[PDB]
Design a protein around this motif. Structure first.
Motif: not given
Lengths: 49, 45, 347, 49, 308, 47, 95, 299
Positions: C101-109, E255-256, H163-167
């Motif tokens: 739910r975090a778009p790329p270019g985002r350091q979700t950290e 980034g998958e 990418p797992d939707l499941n977990v």
């Protein structure tokens, strides 16, 4: 002049009340008034022939 | 459903009479519990 | 002591169908079907048992929710008789979701560090921390949103009563949340009106109204020996009072989060709108009045409906209450009914 | 083919087989019930509102 | 029950007062939430925007704004209607009078509609004081959303304006169960069709995302099912653009780890999923009958309970 | 048709008013007319 | 109110209520009979089938059942609607 | 509360009567609010519509059409369930039973169809009377919507996959979607019909706007404003889908009608509008799975 408008009568009726003991069906059943069925889950009758 | 057994001993003072005489086996299914006892069974005592 | 016009007071100074109900039904027998043809202490005990008498002789305009939390965030004592408490849910996702739910270019950290850092700044055991106060948001976003020092006066309130660290840590969390598409809403739902806290040490048991009218609560001058009661917006900075143009109708109260998405670097705006529009009309008026649409996704605001103020007029604005030394523009809202509502922001 | 058989049946050819027709058909009857003298036990509970 | 009283002004001829007696159970739109109100704020003369009566797409936008209130009782000098948008909090279920060719069933959410059928009776002219009352037609949301779509498209296609010959499709006629229902085709106003077109176009755009392209890959796969299942065969309407749209991943995965499928559903579900609601007024009531009668005949009173 | 008037009866009635309650609650079950049944039962084994 | 009207309306009130109660208390009088039928009809075989049945129930068996059912199949076709079919003749009815 | 009393049928086995005793606090959908209802009317055998037992979509239809009522007291020869839709809002606290995630002090539980989780688990069969009961799972609205959309997406991948939707991480511990085995084959076969109505309504929505926008704004303020805020969004998506796809105002408008309806019918099925809220007091504030939870009628 005068012109009036009249109620020439009113008529009602009477409901008939039917007892179920004045019928011929009440022979087909042994009726009895059991005050708490809401308290008894399972009733049974037994037959030994 | 394991029908609750017939309660002999309540029938020791019956409340009325059955006016039919029929072999009841035919109608078997219309009863919740039914037995066919030949002569005597140990389970009535 | 008695009037001239008697019929209007017998009803004012103060059923028989239920009496007539049992009369035909219950009085009737065997129906239906028919056959043809010890000064003070003693007084107190007796009264408690009796109270159980009357309350058990009978039996809806009130609902109380009660919860135990810490005083880290929130804090009931600083706050007062009328206050908005917002719940905060599941600290466990220190941006675990940030993964998605975090778009790329985002350091979700960012959240995990911002947030975990918040914890270092202020473990799980006896209790958890829920219940963010309305106050604590106004200060956290005070420098963020538009009016300063009417807004900062609220910030002076919290630093001196409720720590600037936590405000700053929590502000860093709001920035980090609005950053990564996990919003302050989809967190922080409305909880109630703060009836009575009952705190111990770092612990608090907060009773507060799930819904129903506020003014009818513990009441009194103030609840307990504190002060009065009100749902005072706490900001002349909040209490955006819509209905610049208006006709009598029940005013309504909503909760809006406005955001900045690189226009100001993930701005957080939190305030209340008071106007007569049914939520299907608020989305329109929220589209206007706002230029915060900066894409610079497109999800600028998210709103839920708190309830009704079924009288237009009590909207007092007071920069006059003390929650300790600090003084805050305080707007008093006279009479409020709480409808929790739901959060709707799709765009 | 089911398209072919539209052409046959509308234009009146016999497509080499035939049917059996079945219709569910209803009526309104009038009955006589007979019942023996004590044919049922009918316990009656208390009435509630 | 926060009932809103509505004062009958002066005297409306004994024939007019007999007309209001039978308006109980009908719906009113009041332009406020009030306790004191005037009879003329409810009348169709109040629906009039500057100089002009709104068309039948203009009313939907007017019924969008203001509050539906179902008349509960009518007294000699006041009309009592409790504003469903707010004062719906009754223990049991205010009576809605079904005014429509349609029939409610049980559980049907009820959204209202300006009167829109070919044969209709929503005039209720009151001569003593100049005013009138158009009562909206209650209707199941499945049907009320089919109608709004008809009015929207009719106002839109006409607006192209269809270049192609002068004989267009019907779009003016429905079916609910049996019973052909013929809508009223009369006027379409720029502003009324614009907003309806503006918000239609606007929302169908936001329902398209990056993950959406992953779904558009599946059109050839759908038509594979068009033809080997009896369902999925039915799903695709004969006039299906999708059928004409087939007559792909594009790499570009950032980034998958986003899960654009899931995110594409949510996005579509919000904006495009909720279109009956934004184009028209959403249901606030649903038929419920305690006596266990499972439908409501046309003209009967439908016991109604809060939102579906 | 053999007659018009006939002579029918009135309703039968049964309650749990006696020692038939003590069984209803403690063992948690009832038998119709225990007092008769029980008495006509007990009375047989002394004779 | 001090009024002659409000009293009179309250008269209509007491009055209409008494009519409703007389009616619903008579429903359980009507309904106990209507319900008595249903429980008789629910347990009652059609006579066309019951006559052939009876004469095989007291006798003393797979062929006896085949001979049974084949015969119910006929007697039901025949003797249903008997008063409509045979109703023009006495001894057939009276039997 | 308006209790409605469901009538247990004739004699049931003693192990079945103990199965019902454990069903207090479970949600029932009752077709009509009649005070006296049968048990067969409530049982899952009464959800049959097209001659088949309903799929997850056919269920979600029914859950939106009948009335859920929580079971308050189960009595031999009666079930007493108090409908959620009737009475004033925020009143009639009746206890639920939590199933799966916690149900914290609020959040408006949705009752979603059972198959979304262990399928047959919760069937609760009664053999004596030959009926069965599938109780919906009470999940919060944010999580209920996340899940139901989460599974449809998995379904789409499955529709054509190479990418797992499941977990799922909810609260304290990672939640699990997949029960592995063939449960997925059972889960995926019931979402089969929901996935298609989803796939269709998307593919039919885009192609219908992608045809309409270029077949509109070419016939005022419509044009300018449209292309204005649609820059590199709608138009870009137009060239890209028209790249890997094919391209009629008259079929357009008549298909725009039939789509616009089918769409909102899915938005109604979907979004799982909350039946109730949790508002506790003198209570734990988090209801652990399998524990009765307070609950009130409106969100």
């Amino acid at each position: 002049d005068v012109e009036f408008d009249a109620l020439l009568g009113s008529y009602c009726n009477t409901l008939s009340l039917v007892r179920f003991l004045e019928l011929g069906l009440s022979v087909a059943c042994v009726c009895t008034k059991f005050p708490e069925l809401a308290y008894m889950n399972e009733g049974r009758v037994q037959f030994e022939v | 459903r394991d029908p609750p057994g017939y309660r002999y001993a309540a029938a020791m003072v019956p409340t009325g009479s059955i006016l039919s005489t029929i072999e009841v086996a035919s109608h078997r299914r219309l009863f919740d519990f039914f037995a066919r006892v030949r002569s005597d069974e140990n389970s009535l005592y | 002591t008695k009037p001239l016009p008697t019929a209007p007071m017998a009803w004012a100074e103060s059923s028989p169908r239920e009496l007539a109900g049992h009369a035909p039904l219950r009085r009737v027998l065997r129906p239906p079907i028919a056959r043809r043809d010890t000064r003070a202490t003693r007084d107190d005990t007796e009264q408690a048992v009796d109270k159980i008498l009357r309350g058990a002789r009978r039996a809806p305009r009130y609902h109380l929710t009660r919860q135990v939390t810490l005083t880290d965030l929130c804090q009931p004592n600083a706050e007062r008789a009328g206050a908005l408490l917002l719940a905060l849910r599941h600290p466990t996702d220190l941006p675990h979701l940030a993964r998605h739910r975090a778009p790329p270019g985002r350091q979700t950290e960012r959240l995990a560090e911002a947030w975990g850092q918040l914890l270092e700044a202020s473990e799980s055991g006896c209790a958890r921390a829920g219940l963010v106060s309305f106050n604590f948001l106004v200060a956290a976003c005070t420098a963020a949103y538009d009016a300063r020092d009417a807004a900062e006066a609220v910030r002076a309130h919290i630093t001196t009563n409720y720590a600037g660290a936590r405000l700053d840590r929590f502000s860093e969390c709001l920035r980090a949340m609005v950053h990564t598409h996990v919003f302050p809403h989809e967190v922080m739902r409305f909880f109630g009106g703060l009836v009575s806290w009952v705190t111990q040490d770092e612990l608090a048991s907060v009773t507060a109204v799930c819904s129903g009218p506020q003014e009818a609560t513990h009441t009194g001058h103030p609840g307990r020996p504190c002060s009065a009661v009100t749902i005072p917006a706490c900001a002349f900075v909040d209490l955006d009072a819509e209905l610049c143009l208006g006709g009598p109708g029940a005013a309504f109260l909503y909760l809006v989060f406005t955001y900045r998405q690189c226009r100001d670097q993930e701005l957080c705006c939190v305030y209340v709108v008071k106007s007569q529009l049914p939520p299907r009309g608020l989305e329109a008026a929220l589209e206007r009045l706002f230029g915060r649409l900066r894409i610079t996704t497109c999800t600028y605001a998210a709103f839920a409906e708190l309830g009704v103020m079924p009288d237009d007029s009590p909207r007092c604005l007071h920069r006059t209450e003390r929650f300790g030394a600090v003084g805050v523009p305080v707007v008093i809202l006279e009479g409020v009914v709480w409808r929790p509502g739901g959060w709707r922001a799709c765009a | 083919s089911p398209v072919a058989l539209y052409h046959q049946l509308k234009t009146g050819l016999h497509p080499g087989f035939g049917f059996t027709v079945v219709r569910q058909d209803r009526f309104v009857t009038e009955n006589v019930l007979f019942s023996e003298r004590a044919s049922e036990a009918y316990f009656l509970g208390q009435l509630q509102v | 029950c926060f009932e809103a009283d509505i004062a009958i002004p002066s005297g409306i001829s004994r024939p007019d007062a007999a007309a209001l007696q039978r308006c109980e159970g009908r719906v009113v739109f009041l332009p406020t939430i009030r306790r004191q109100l005037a009879l003329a704020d409810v009348a169709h003369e109040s629906f009039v925007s500057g100089g002009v009566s709104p068309d039948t797409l203009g009313l939907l936008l007017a019924y969008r704004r203001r509050f539906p209130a179902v008349i509960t009782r009518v007294l000699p000098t006041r009309i009592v209607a409790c504003p469903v948008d707010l004062g719906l909090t009754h223990a049991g279920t205010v009576n809605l009078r079904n005014t429509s060719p349609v029939d409610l069933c049980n559980g049907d959410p009820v959204s209202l509609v300006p009167p829109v059928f070919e044969g209709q009776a929503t005039d209720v002219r009151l001569e003593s004081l100049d005013l009138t009352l158009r009562f909206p037609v209650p209707l199941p949301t499945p049907l009320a959303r089919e109608i709004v779509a008809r009015l929207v498209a009719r106002g839109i296609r006409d607006l192209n304006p269809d270049r192609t010959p002068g004989e267009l499709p019907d779009l003016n006629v429905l079916y609910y169960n049996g019973a052909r229902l013929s809508l009223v085709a009369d006027v379409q106003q720029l502003a009324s069709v614009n907003t309806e077109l503006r918000s239609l176009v606007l929302n169908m755009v936001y329902s398209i995302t990056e993950g959406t392209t992953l779904i558009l890959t599946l059109i050839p796969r759908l038509l594979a099912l068009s033809a080997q299942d009896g369902y999925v065969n039915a799903l695709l309407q004969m006039q299906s653009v999708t059928r004409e749209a087939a007559q792909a991943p594009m790499l570009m995965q950032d980034g998958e780890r986003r899960l654009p499928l899931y995110e594409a559903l949510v996005a579509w579900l919000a904006h495009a999923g909720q279109l009956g609601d934004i184009l028209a007024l959403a249901p606030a009531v649903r038929v419920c009958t305690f006596d266990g009668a499972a439908v409501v005949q046309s003209g009967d009173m439908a016991p109604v309970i809060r939102y579906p | 048709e053999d007659t018009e008037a006939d002579v029918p009866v009135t309703y039968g009635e049964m309650v749990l008013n006696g020692a038939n309650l003590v069984t209803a609650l403690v063992m948690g079950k009832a038998v119709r007319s225990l007092d008769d049944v029980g008495r006509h039962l007990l009375d047989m084994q002394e004779e | 109110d001090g009024t002659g009207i409000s009293l009179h309306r309250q008269l209509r009130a007491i009055q209409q209520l008494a009519r409703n109660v007389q009616a619903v208390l008579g429903a359980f009088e009507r309904g106990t009979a209507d319900q008595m039928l249903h429980v008789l009809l629910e347990k009652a075989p059609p006579l066309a089938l019951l006559l052939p049945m009876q004469r095989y129930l007291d006798n003393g068996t797979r062929v006896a059942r085949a001979t049974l059912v084949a015969e119910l199949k006929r007697s039901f076709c025949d003797t249903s609607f008997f008063l409509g079919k045979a109703g023009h003749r006495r001894e057939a009815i009276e039997a």
